[PDB]
Amino acid sequence: PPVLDLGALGQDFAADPYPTYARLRAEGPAHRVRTPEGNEVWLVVGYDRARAVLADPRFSKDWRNSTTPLTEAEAALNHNMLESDPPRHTRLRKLVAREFTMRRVELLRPRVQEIVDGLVDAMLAAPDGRADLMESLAWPLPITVISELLGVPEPDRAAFRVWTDAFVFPDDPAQAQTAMAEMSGYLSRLIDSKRGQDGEDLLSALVRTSDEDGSRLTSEELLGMAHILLVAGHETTVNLIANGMYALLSHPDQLAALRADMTLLDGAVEEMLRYEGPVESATYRFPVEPVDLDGTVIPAGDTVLVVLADAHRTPERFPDPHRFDIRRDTAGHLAFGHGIHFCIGAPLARLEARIAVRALLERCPDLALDVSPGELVWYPNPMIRGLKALPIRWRR
Numbered sequence: 169p170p171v172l173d174l175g176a177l178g179q180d181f182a183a184d185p186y187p188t189y190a191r192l193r194a195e196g197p198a199h200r201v202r203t204p205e206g207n208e209v210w211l212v213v214g215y216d217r218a219r220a221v222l223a224d225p226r227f228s229k230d231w232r233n234s235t236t237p238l239t240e241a242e243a244a245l246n247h248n249m250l251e252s253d254p255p256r257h258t259r260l261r262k263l264v265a266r267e268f269t270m271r272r273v274e275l276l277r278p279r280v281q282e283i284v285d286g287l288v289d290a291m292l293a294a295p296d297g298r299a300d301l302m303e304s305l306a307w308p309l310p311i312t313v314i315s316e317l318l319g320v321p322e323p324d325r326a327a328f329r330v331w332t333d334a335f336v337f338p339d340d341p342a343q344a345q346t347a348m349a350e351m352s353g354y355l356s357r358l359i360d361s362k363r364g365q366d367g368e369d370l371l372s373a374l375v376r377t378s379d380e381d382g383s384r385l386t387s388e389e390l391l392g393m394a395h396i397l398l399v400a401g402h403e404t405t406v407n408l409i410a411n412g413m414y415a416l417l418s419h420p421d422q423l424a425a426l427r428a429d430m431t432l433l434d435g436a437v438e439e440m441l442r443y444e445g446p447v448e449s450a451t452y453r454f455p456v457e458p459v460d461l462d463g464t465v466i467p468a469g470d471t472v473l474v475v476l477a478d479a480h481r482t483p484e485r486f487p488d489p490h491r492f493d494i495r496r497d498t499a500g501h502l503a504f505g506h507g508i509h510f511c512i513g514a515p516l517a518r519l520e521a522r523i524a525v526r527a528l529l530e531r532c533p534d535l536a537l538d539v540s541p542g543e544l545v546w547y548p549n550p551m552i553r554g555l556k557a558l559p560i561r562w563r564r
């Protein structure tokens with residue numbers, strides 16, 4: 169079977185990838201494709217097989233197992249738990265697990281509520297009663313929360329944001345490299361700036377751990393840890409909030425049901441993850457040996473992407489999959505992954521999204537989508553399902 173070119177689609181494919189994936193899934197679990205940016209990878213589609221591959225230790229996350237070359241700017245940032253296997257994965261994650269439990273995250277609630285209250289205050293001063301929800305709330309909220317956790321000073325954040333866009337959503341390869349190089353230079357200086365300042369933010373704590381014992385946390389791993397916690401804080405929750413509010417505003421009967429009973433809110437947020445989560449495909453996996461998936465054999469070291477999005481539209485697992493239904497049974501969705509790499513930030517992402525959504529509904533009378541769905545534009549990245557903008561309006 170020939171390599172399918174996703175780039176050739178466009179677009180189209182970036183707005184609505186689902187039929188493309190579902191067509192693949194009818195033929196079987198694994199497919200050689202060429203991403204819009206030009207990388208040859210495997211797609212794993214279909215819920216059951218997606219779930220198994222996510223947790224299967226025959227599929228490594230360590231780039232030493234991959235046959236794909238890394239540039240210097242890329243390699244400098246890959247000593248992090250998401251790009252590791254046990255035992256390194258185990259050791260790195262244990263260093264921060266305690267910061268991200270539900271009970272520790274619950275203590276951030278007053279401060280997350282305050283950040284939301286202020287962003288919405290400012291949004292609602294708009295004289296025309298219109299805004300882009302992404303500029304006004306979905307982007308600044310997660311950024312502010314994770315910046316204050318890690319200790320990124322406020323004046324540094326705007327630059328920081330440009331980099332983390334420039335290489336999550338490139339448009340030009342040399343720019344992505346430059347940004348990675350700069351982000352890495354910045355994080356090193358930030359890290360150095362904490363030494364001997366007795367700060368109590370998370371990065372100051374990790375700096376002390378590393379300086380007390382460089383075999384528990386190396387300086388490369390310390391930079392990798394600040395990087396992964398910050399980027400994940402920049403680019404996932406944003407899209408959960410935007411995509412989810414889009415789902416609600418474009419399914420007016422679900423929005424009303426939720427208005428009528430706000431106790432449905434937690435279950436509505438799960439169905440946002442299930443129906444249109446920010447993660448369209450999981451991060452790279454590399455088979456340590458060749459892996460046979462129903463007669464399709466995947467060679468050692470090839471790149472494998474597990475397609476979360478298609479898993480979530482598998483009718484056998486989620487009946488009536490294309491329906492956004494806030495009361496659906498969402499248990500078992502893969503929006504936060506599955507297995508040893510299951511999202512460490514999930515309690516924090518849920519806290520943010522629940523608060524932001526409830527603030528929008530309670531505070532925006534007759535909240536409306538301010539363009540038709542057909543006018544929205546989706547970024548092309550096949551790992552991310554994300555809008556460029558979400559125009560909303562409300563009654564002023």
Ligand code: HEM
Binds near residue numbers: 222446511
């Ligand atoms: C709605 C928001 C989020 C979604 C949908 C999400 C999704 C995911 C997924 C699918 C994975 C597993 C990747 C894989 O196995 O290939 C993951 C891992 C990870 N996420 Fe989240 N994420 C979100 C928010 C966050 C936040 C706010 C943080 C910051 C604390 C975070 C930090 C991480 C880290 C460090 C990992 C690697 C965990 C490991 O390897 O053990 N994520 N995320």
Ligand SMILES: C[C@@H]1C[C@H](N(C)C)[C@@H](O)[C@H](OC2CCCCCCCCCCCC2)O1
Binds near residue numbers: 336399403404
């Ligand atoms: C480690 C990988 C490398 C990749 N490129 C440099 C090739 C980058 O775009 C990706 O991160 C994106 C993709 C979203 C996946 C969601 C998982 C959330 C965990 C944090 C990873 C960064 C998130 C953004 O992180």
